[PDB]
């Protein structure tokens, strides 16, 4: 019904990681899920 | 040596400095050129490509830029020689092969 | 009747450019009528005077027609 | 047992307000879980040259300790007692707020207003936050989207207040001192520029006394001379073309200047905006998407992704569209989708606005799912609005577009208006500015 | 052979914008009329040419049947003679040029339809001729029947003065003197050669007018596009 | 896709040749030429085919086929005025759109250049055969000279000439003829110009640096559809105050007299775009010698690309250069002023001088200049 | 930071109506455009005056020239054709016949039987003065030219394939399909006709 | 209103909960998940996950699309290693046109050739764009080091198989394991007694290894400035008590972030790392739990010169707190910070959603969110050090990717 | 080769306006005169030189054809 | 009230259909008044001069 949050284009350089407060919220804590959809982008979760 | 009196008239009468534009910007492009320009480093590239696109920009308008903003004849580097030098020595290797 | 045009061609006449030119006219004139045995004439000193009289003319003429 | 119905008994909004003039707004249900926090008229818009990304500069120091619970106390406390402590800065809003126990509404209604008031903003701790900064201005410099939309505004809204970024410039970070950041922070953070809203399982009763309790200190006096007001901000029809063709791929974000917050007008463009709609590569659509724009980009790979948008800002907005897309395919994407708004412009079909009507009914209902959506809906409402729009509210402006509004509305806009153009990466191709401004009008109209 | 070019008179239709003067015109047709027609020929004036411009349809028709013309043939197979109409053109004075010359001492007189035009110098020019001929310079002799005039090329004409004071009543009363004779048939010469003379200079002033507007107009539009890109301003930020 | 324009086999060459071609951002009014002279070429053919739907090419009705046009046909007047008029701009348009070539170094496009001496010539031939349609003096007379000079050819020089005539002289045939060349070649003429910017597209255009511009394209669209609007109206402006004040101005009176092969006249010189070659046939003295020297003084247009020694492609930043072309330029315009004087004194030995300096700037000192340029900069 | 890129100064450059920064643009937006298309909008009205000229003319050259229009009409004094003769004249390179009918031919054409005609057109229906009639001297079989006063009609006979016709013109025998031409014209007087 | 269930003769199960929002959500939740490929069809689910919207035999895969976006409509398919999730929302009025797309795509699709054939290339788009989170590397690397079979299994399809997911395989997989004795079909904004009546008329469809745990390790050599690397031992299985205890060492430890730019400072291993290295970094206990079985360890990001010193400290706290230092504080944080994101996690509809389809599944019927804390409380200090215990001696698993120079092996630990 | 493949252009920004917000003719006289003369001075010592000699050689040789054309004072 | 450009603009030139319209009816007007008013400015520079002018005195 609604887009998604980060839209994801293929081929698209890669967002940049320069300090500790970015990083921390990306250490993986559960195991994957993915979803795939109708309208919304798919994407790929702890 | 006492040329160089009419070299640095010569320099300002031609006048591709008031664009902003070094000497080798002028160069007219054959085979040769083209491989020099495709050999040199990202900085002198992007350099020669604003240069260029400052200049034409000029061109357009039909204005030149303050004197301060001009190309000093001392500071013009020649910077396509040692590129362009070998892209022609290495051509002229191979044309001598060919007998 | 008075030509208009003989009126003017007089009243050019006596200018400075015109009467000098006249007088270059005369010289001639009474060089060669003077003279015997000379093929030279004088049209180019009678085209003279001609030339700066009827210029004067031109700008004058047209006035009274 | 209908949907006509289901909005008649969703949960009321209450609306409270103190003597400084704080509001105090409330949505309840049966719930172990809440959010709560403050929202705040104050951002970039708020401020100028000089003190540009401050707002955001304190975003960094607000959870870094208070005068009550300093260094990591803060920090420690929120941790122990299981919340979930997060804040934003935009333009125009910032807003700190807390995910919490329902029982633990008191602490964290305290914490808050400890986080607000109390804002330790160590000199040594300044000093870090500094670094940390110039950083994040790093990183985002690699996210393209990021640069083409702070490009859209700066060019949009250029030689105003709009135009600037939320960061600020890294000169400003480099200098700004603490002096700055408490005369910034008096100047902005007053109770009637700032609401505290809270959902979940709460007595609204009970967050309207916390708020005394904790936010009465809270001043609301700006003398006569220095009373922060935003002066309108003028859109200029431009572009800005950071080229860049060492990139992969190509960003460009395209805007007319949309109506503003308050403007009815915005339900019948969010209504064309859904009917043209949004896409990327993951989408399992292809060609068999509603949206032509959508089914075109996809049956002939002209973009990787693209969104409608519709920002609004206080009497202003940028209503558009931004994609990303192959370095042969800028002029594919842009006449594509420019024939998208003239098609809605001059000839918008029934049975399509029905389509983006219906869109749009989801989306404001399923966006509204669970505690922190609905805190922020309130807090955010208030300042924009001055109140809380009920969902049926929202359905009946939206029941009132059809084909003939889209149409008009649309027109109002888009056609024959100047847009504000950026593009970043390998631009070489995105069309010249007239060529786009030539294609905001069909000469067959 | 030297040369004397004629001075630049300042007649009625000099300018940009002068029409002709069409009274003159009407006069200066008479003394093509009453003087030269016996001697020179105006192939592509017929007398409708007249009507419109110096003359009314009616009188045009008049001065038209006043002059013979062949026709023919007849069903017997015979060629006769018959009064002009509108549509016969100005009727040549002899059968052919070796008839011509027989009857003016050798020389051919030119047709006049277009002598404005095929002489350097046009109306100034003839004009000049008609009024210049004069007594020769001393030193010279021209040969038989060859006059002088100082404008003609080698300053020697087979032609005599054809006009001179009274050499014609006007119909509209003018005092015909030579220079009035002379203005008047050039006037007349110069719509022989170029009839269009006066439409060409309406759409003249047409055009002045519309390029006026439409050059500015057009000039605008182009800086308005261009703006786009006049008052672009560059930027190198490398990294 | 859906854009037509790039999709439709026809609409995509046109797209492609008018609307989205990049031109340079930076090119001059100099660059105007080649609009211009495409529309003098339909404007030649316009008002042509309808001069040519009253005209005849019989030696006895032609002169009063012509002058039955300017009395008689309805505008028919401002129609041929026009078109001798447009003769004129077609030649000042080339001539303005040569020059550019020649300073800016256009012609180093080699084929494009070329075809652009072809087109050069084939204008050349369509304006002579047209001068004579007519059939006034200058035109049979002009006609006569310049044709026989192909008798000083050996051997078969005498042959070829009666051949062009199709009898012992300019006579039927030759007017006929001329006719149907003088029609038909315009149309190759077209042709031509179509393979002329055939070539052209790929490379796209020069412009008044020298240096390349793909680093500032622009869409042809709408920066050029405006200026060549523009460009047109001033070329209309031009065209028009001849016609309408001036019309008689470019050419010759003698041609209002019909041709007379008994009656010569004074000084029989061609329309003011030859005079130039005009001057340089009679600055030698030998016939076959002048001829190869007329010759040359075109087709010499061929050679300038391999002449060219500076390094640098434009004369923009070459002072020299810039002053030898200006002084070929004048020298042009003083033989096109040689070749309408008589062949007397001073202008035998003027434009003997000015011949020697015609082929002495292209040939030897403006090569050098380059050169001097070049080593003035450590080039 | 790419936040350090910021828009340069356009004052310069500028319509005054969208100088004030603080200010809303979209006033001067239905202003700005307004005096733009007017350009835009006058020029093709200029532009459109000429073409309509332009092409006006050259459609006009392809329209008859003066030479062929002067040859367009005759001026016959009707005076100078008396009582029952049939004059000739040459007009469009074509015989033209002028026709005095008598006071007897006119009560006769108009009481001739009209369905014997091979082809009907009444006297009054090809005259416009009774006393004349005015017809092209070309017949319509085979394109000769028919003798004044001869034939069965007391009209006119052709002597190419046999046509007579009567003093209206029309055909009564012989081949020709038609009855001879009758041309456009008016009398300007009552001794005057214009035919043309 | 509270939640109503249902468990059919045939196996299956309906849950519902009527709450009259103006939103409905109905989801169909089946065992269906990438364990249950074999080393003959590894990637069949990955394509039946974009599969659906592929034409059925009650719906064209035009009308799929169209009908769905007229509404304002949305569908979704969710996999883990362990199942698969077909979600559908719209507004409440149009429940049963969504119903009808929900019951086509999972009862009978047609996989038809050319259409199978048309979307290969998705897989690779959708792989390529997922393996863009390094995560998504190193997780899916950790689970196939771990264990020899099931959940070894890759969600995205292994690049050698791109292209050659038959029809039939696709047929096969469905057929085989979207059965009634394996599905579970959960809803809000729907009465329960036409959701039975749904399941029982349209979703009655007759039915169709355990997971050996191995220990490895596998490195991705690749040259990044960062080095992701997870370390893991078996844990144990989701519905036992012990599973509880991992859980609360997962918080106990630090298991993400709370404050935003925060330093979590009750971090247990956050702390133990910013103690030893300073330049950008971050870890968290990891922790997965399985039908069979679970892993438990943890996450780190480090640079990589100093991947070695972060995962020693790392595993280092977690010796300490297996030798026995835990206070009640800790533990008590620990349970607080569990309890609040079990809340919190289904406090939206969505998420709700997950939870009761989610259990429907993997036990018998639901578990008040009551009885949940009430467990939580359950542990004692005393289990979460045996957790940790079984940890320290436990085989070992490892992941990592990065530039790997200075990552230590399992061995070298 | 169309746009997009035409060549290698790296960190150029480029700033510009649309045709509605500026003025067609900002400073016309004001910068425009003095940039024509500018221009003019630039060139001139290159352009009017040959023109200059032409007039000379032209005004010289005609009247020394009229002269030439007198009848000689001998 | 907005200024007279712009009544022109939401009036007339906004649809193309509406500009079009607008410059055929313009371009009728223009013709008449500029034919008219030129001519006008023709003939009053050539008093007396034309036949136009001297038409009356052989009628
Ligand atoms: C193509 C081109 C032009 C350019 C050339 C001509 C015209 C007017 C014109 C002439 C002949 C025509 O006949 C045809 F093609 F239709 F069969 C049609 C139109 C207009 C423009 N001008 C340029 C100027 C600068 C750089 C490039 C070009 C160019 O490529």
Redesign the pocket.
């Known amino acids: 019904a609604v887009p998604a949050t980060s839209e994801s284009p293929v081929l698209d350089l890669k967002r940049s990681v320069l300090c500790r407060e970015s990083l921390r919220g990306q250490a993986a804590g559960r195991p994957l899920v993915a979803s795939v959809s109708l309208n919304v982008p798919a994407s790929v979760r702890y | 040596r006492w040329l160089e009196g009419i070299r640095k008239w010569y320099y300002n009468a031609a006048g591709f400095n008031k664009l902003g534009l070094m000497r080798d910007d002028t160069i007219h492009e054959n085979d040769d050129v083209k491989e020099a320009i495709r050999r040199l480093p990202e900085n002198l590239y992007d350099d020669r490509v604003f240069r260029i696109k400052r200049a034409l920009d000029l061109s357009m308008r039909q204005q030149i830029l303050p004197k301060e903003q001009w190309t000093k004849y001392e500071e013009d580097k020649s910077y396509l020689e040692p590129y362009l030098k070998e892209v022609i020595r290495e051509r002229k290797e191979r044309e001598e092969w060919a007998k | 009747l008075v030509d208009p045009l003989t009126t003017v061609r007089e009243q050019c006449e006596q200018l400075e450019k015109c009467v000098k030119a006249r007088e270059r006219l005369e010289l001639c004139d009474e060089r060669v009528s003077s003279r015997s045995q000379t093929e030279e004439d004088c049209t180019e000193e009678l085209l003279d005077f001609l030339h700066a009289r009827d210029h004067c003319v031109a700008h004058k003429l047209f006035n009274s027609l | 047992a209908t949907y006509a119905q289901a909005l008649q008994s969703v949960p009321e909004t209450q609306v409270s307000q103190l003597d400084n003039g704080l509001r105090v707004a409330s949505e309840q249900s049966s719930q172990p879980t809440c959010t709560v926090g403050v929202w705040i008229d104050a951002g970039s818009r708020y401020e100028s040259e000089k003190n540009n990304g401050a707002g955001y500069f304190v975003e960094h120091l607000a959870f870094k300790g208070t005068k009550n619970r300093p260094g990591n106390a803060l920090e420690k406390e929120v941790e122990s007692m299981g919340a979930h402590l997060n804040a934003y800065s935009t333009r125009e809003h910032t807003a700190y707020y807390i995910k919490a126990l329902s029982k633990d509404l008191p602490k964290a209604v305290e914490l808050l207003a400890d986080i607000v008031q109390n804002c330790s903003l160590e000199d040594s701790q300044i000093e870090k936050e500094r670094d940390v900064i110039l950083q994040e201005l790093q990183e985002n410099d690699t996210s393209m989207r990021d640069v083409v939309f702070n490009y859209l505004h700066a060019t949009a809204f250029q030689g105003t207040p709009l135009a600037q970024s939320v960061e600020g410039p890294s000169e400003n970070v480099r200098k700004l001192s603490r002096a700055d950041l408490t005369e910034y922070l008096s100047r902005h953070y007053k109770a009637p520029r700032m609401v505290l809203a809270a959902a979940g399982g709460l007595e609204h009763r009970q967050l309207l006394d916390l708020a005394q309790k904790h936010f009465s200190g809270l001043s609301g006096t700006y003398d006569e001379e220095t009373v922060p007001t935003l002066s309108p901000c003028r859109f200029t029809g431009s572009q800005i073309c950071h080229r860049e063709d060492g990139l992969p791929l190509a960003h460009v974000a395209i805007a007319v200047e949309g109506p503003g917050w308050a403007h009815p007008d915005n339900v019948a463009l969010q209504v064309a905006n859904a009917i043209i709609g949004h896409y990327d590569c993951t989408y399992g659509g292809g060609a068999h998407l509603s949206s032509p724009l959508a089914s075109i980009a996809a049956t002939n790979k002209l973009c990787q992704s693209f969104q409608t948008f519709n920002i609004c800002y206080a009497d202003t907005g940028l209503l558009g569209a931004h994609f990303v897309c192959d370095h042969m395919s800028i002029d594919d994407m842009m006449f594509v989708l420019q024939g998208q708004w003239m098609r809605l412009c001059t000839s918008a079909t029934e049975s399509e606005v029905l389509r983006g009507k219906n869109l749009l009914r989801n989306a404001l209902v399923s966006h509204l799912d669970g505690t922190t959506p609905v805190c922020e809906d309130i807090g955010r409402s208030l300042l924009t609005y001055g109140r809380r729009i009920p969902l049926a509210e929202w359905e009946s402006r939206i029941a009132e577009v059809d084909a003939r509004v889209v149409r008009e509305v649309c027109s109002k806009y888009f056609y024959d208006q100047c847009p504000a153009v950026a593009g970043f990466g390998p631009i070489e191709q995105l069309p010249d500015y007239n060529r786009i401004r030539s294609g905001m009008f069909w000469l067959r109209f | 052979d030297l040369e004397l070019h004629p001075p630049s008179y300042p007649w009625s239709h000099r300018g940009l914008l002068s029409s002709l003067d069409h009274t003159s015109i009407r006069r200066g047709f008479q003394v093509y009329k009453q003087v030269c027609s016996s001697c020179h020929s105006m192939d592509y004036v017929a007398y409708r040419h007249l009507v419109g411009v110096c003359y009314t349809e009616d009188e045009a028709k008049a001065l038209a049947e006043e002059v013979e013309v062949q026709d023919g043939p007849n069903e017997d197979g015979e060629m006769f003679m018959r009064p002009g109409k509108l549509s016969d053109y100005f009727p040549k004075p002899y059968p052919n040029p070796e008839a011509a010359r027989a009857a003016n001492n050798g020389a051919l007189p030119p047709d006049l339809s277009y002598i404005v035009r095929a002489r350097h110098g046009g109306e100034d020019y003839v004009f000049s001729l008609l009024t210049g001929y004069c007594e020769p310079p001393t030193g010279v002799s021209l040969r038989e029947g060859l006059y002088f005039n100082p404008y003609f090329p080698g300053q020697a004409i087979g032609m005599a003065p054809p006009i001179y004071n009274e050499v014609l009543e006007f119909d509209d009363g003018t005092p015909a003197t030579m220079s009035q004779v002379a203005k008047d048939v050039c006037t007349f010469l110069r719509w022989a050669a170029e009839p269009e003379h006066d439409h060409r200079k309406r759409m003249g002033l047409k055009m002045l007018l519309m390029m006026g507007l439409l050059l500015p107009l057009v000039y605008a539009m182009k800086r308005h596009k261009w703006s786009v890109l006049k008052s672009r301003k560059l930027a190198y930020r490398p990294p | 896709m859906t854009n037509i324009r790039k999709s439709h086999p026809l609409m995509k060459i046109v797209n492609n040749?008018?609307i989205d071609?990049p031109?340079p951002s930076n090119?001059s009014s100099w660059?105007?030429f080649?609009?211009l002279?495409?529309?003098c070429?339909?404007l030649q053919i316009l008002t042509g085919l309808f001069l040519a739907m009253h005209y005849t090419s019989d030696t006895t009705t032609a002169f009063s086929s012509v002058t039955h046009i300017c009395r008689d046909v309805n505008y028919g007047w401002i129609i041929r005025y026009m078109h001798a008029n447009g003769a004129s701009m077609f030649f000042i348009c080339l001539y303005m759109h040569v020059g550019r070539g020649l300073y800016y170094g256009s012609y180093t496009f080699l084929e494009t250049w070329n075809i652009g001496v072809i087109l050069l010539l084939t204008v050349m031939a369509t304006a002579f055969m047209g001068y004579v349609l007519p059939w006034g003096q200058m035109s049979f007379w002009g006609a006569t000279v310049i044709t026989n000079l192909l008798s000083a050819i050996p051997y078969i020089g005498t042959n070829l000439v009666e051949w062009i005539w199709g009898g012992f002289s300019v006579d039927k045939a030759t007017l006929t003829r001329f006719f149907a060349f003088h029609f038909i070649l315009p149309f190759i003429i077209?042709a031509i110009?179509?393979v002329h910017?055939l070539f052209?597209?790929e490379t796209?255009?020069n412009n008044p640096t020298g240096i390349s511009s793909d680093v500032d394209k622009i869409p042809?669209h709408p920066y050029?559809?405006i200026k060549?609007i523009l460009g047109?109206l001033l070329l209309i402006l031009a065209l028009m105050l001849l016609v309408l004040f001036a019309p008689d101005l470019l050419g010759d009176p003698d041609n209002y007299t019909p041709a007379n092969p008994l009656n010569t006249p004074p000084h029989i010189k061609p329309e003011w775009y030859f005079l130039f070659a005009y001057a340089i046939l009679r600055s030698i003295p030998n016939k076959l010698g002048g001829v190869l020297a007329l010759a040359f003084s075109i087709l010499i247009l061929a050679l300038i690309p391999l002449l060219h020694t500076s390094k640098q492609r434009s004369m923009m930043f070459r002072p020299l250069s810039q002053c030898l072309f200006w002084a070929l330029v004048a020298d042009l315009l003083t033989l096109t002023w040689i070749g309408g004087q008589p062949v007397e004194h001073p202008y035998i030995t003027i434009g003997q001088l000015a011949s020697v300096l015609y082929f002495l700037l292209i040939l030897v000192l403006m090569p050098t200049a380059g050169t001097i340029e070049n080593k003035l900069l450590k080039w | 930071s790419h936040t350090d890129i910021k828009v340069p100064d356009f004052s310069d450059y500028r319509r005054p109506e969208v100088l004030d920064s603080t200010k809303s643009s979209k006033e001067s937006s239905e202003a700005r455009k307004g005096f733009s298309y007017l350009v835009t909008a006058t020029t093709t009205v200029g532009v459109a005056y000429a073409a309509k000229n332009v092409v006006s003319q050259f459609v006009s050259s392809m329209s008859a020239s003066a030479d062929v229009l002067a040859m367009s009409k005759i001026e016959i004094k009707l005076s100078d054709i008396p009582e029952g003769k049939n004059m000739a004249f040459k007009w469009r390179g074509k015989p033209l016949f002028v026709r005095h009918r008598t006071k007897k031919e006119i009560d006769q054409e108009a009481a001739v039987e009209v369905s014997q005609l091979r082809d009907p057109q009444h006297d009054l229906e090809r005259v416009k003065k009774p006393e004349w009639v005015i017809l092209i001297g070309v017949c319509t079989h085979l394109g000769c030219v028919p003798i004044a006063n001869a034939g069965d009609f007391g009209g006119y006979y052709c002597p190419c394939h046999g046509s007579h016709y009567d003093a209206s013109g029309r055909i009564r025998k012989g081949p020709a399909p038609l009855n001879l031409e009758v041309p456009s014209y008016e009398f300007t007087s009552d001794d005057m006709v214009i035919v043309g | 209103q509270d939640l109503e269930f249902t468990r059919l003769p045939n196996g299956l199960v309906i849950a519902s909960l009527e709450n009259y929002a103006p939103a409905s959500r109905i989801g169909l939740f089946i065992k269906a998940g990438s364990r249950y490929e074999n080393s003959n069809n590894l990637g069949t689910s990955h394509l039946l996950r974009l599969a659906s919207s592929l034409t059925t035999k009650g719906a064209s895969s035009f009308k799929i699309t169209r009908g769905i976006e007229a509404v304002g409509g949305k569908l979704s398919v969710t996999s883990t290693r362990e199942n698969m999730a077909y979600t559908v929302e719209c507004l409440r009025d149009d429940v049963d046109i969504l119903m009808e797309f929900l019951l086509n795509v999972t009862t009978a699709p047609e996989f038809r050739r050319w259409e199978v054939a048309a979307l290969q290339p998705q897989l690779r788009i959708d792989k390529a764009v997922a393996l863009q989170n390094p995560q998504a590397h190193v997780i899916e690397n950790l689970h196939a080091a771990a264990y020899r079979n099931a959940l070894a299994n890759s969600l995205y399809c292994p690049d050698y198989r791109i292209g050659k997911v038959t029809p039939v395989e696709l047929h096969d997989y469905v057929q085989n394991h979207f059965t009634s004795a394996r599905m579970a079909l959960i809803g809000l904004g729907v009465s329960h007694p036409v959701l039975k009546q749904v399941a029982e008329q349209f979703l009655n469809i007759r039915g169709g290894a355990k997971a050996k745990y191995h220990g490895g390790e596998i490195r991705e050599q690749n040259g990044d400035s960062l080095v992701h690397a997870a370390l893991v031992a078996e844990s144990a299985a989701i519905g036992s008590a012990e599973a509880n205890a991992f859980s609360v060492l997962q918080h106990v430890l630090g298991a993400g972030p709370h404050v935003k730019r925060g330093s979590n400072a009750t971090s247990s291993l956050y702390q133990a790392v910013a103690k030893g290295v300073h330049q950008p970094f971050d870890v968290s206990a990891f922790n997965a739990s399985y039908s069979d079985s679970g892993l438990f360890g943890f996450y780190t990001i480090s640079q990589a010169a100093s991947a070695g010193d972060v995962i020693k400290a790392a595993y280092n706290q977690v010796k300490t707190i297996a030798q026995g230092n835990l206070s009640n504080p800790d533990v008590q944080a620990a349970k607080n910070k569990l309890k609040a994101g079990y809340l919190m996690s289904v406090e939206s509809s969505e998420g709700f959603l997950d939870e009761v389809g989610s259990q429907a599944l993997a036990a018998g019927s639901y578990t008040p969110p009551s009885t949940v804390l009430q467990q939580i409380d359950a542990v004692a200090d005393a289990d979460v050090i045996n957790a940790a215990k079984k940890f320290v001696s436990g085989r070992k698993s490892m992941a990592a990717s990065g530039n790997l120079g200075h990552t230590p092996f399992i061995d070298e630990l | 080769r169309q746009f997009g493949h035409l060549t290698r252009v790296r960190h150029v920004i480029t700033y510009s306006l649309s045709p509605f917000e500026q003025r067609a003719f900002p400073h016309y006289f004001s910068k425009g005169i003095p940039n024509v003369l500018r221009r003019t001075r630039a060139c001139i010592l290159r352009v009017a030189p040959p023109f200059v000699a032409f007039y000379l050689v032209y005004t010289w040789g005609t009247q020394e054809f009229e002269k030439s054309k007198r009848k000689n004072p001998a | 009230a907005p200024t007279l450009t712009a009544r022109l603009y939401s009036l007339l030139f906004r649809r193309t259909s509406t500009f079009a319209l607008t410059i055929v009816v313009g371009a009728l007007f223009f013709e008449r008044a500029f034919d008219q008013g030129a001519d006008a400015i023709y003939e009053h520079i050539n008093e007396g001069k034309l036949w136009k002018h001297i038409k009356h005195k052989y009628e």
């Open positions: 040749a008018f071609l031109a090119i660059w105007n080649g609009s002279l495409g529309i070429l339909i077209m110009a179509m910017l052209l597209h796209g255009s042809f050029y559809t060549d047109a």
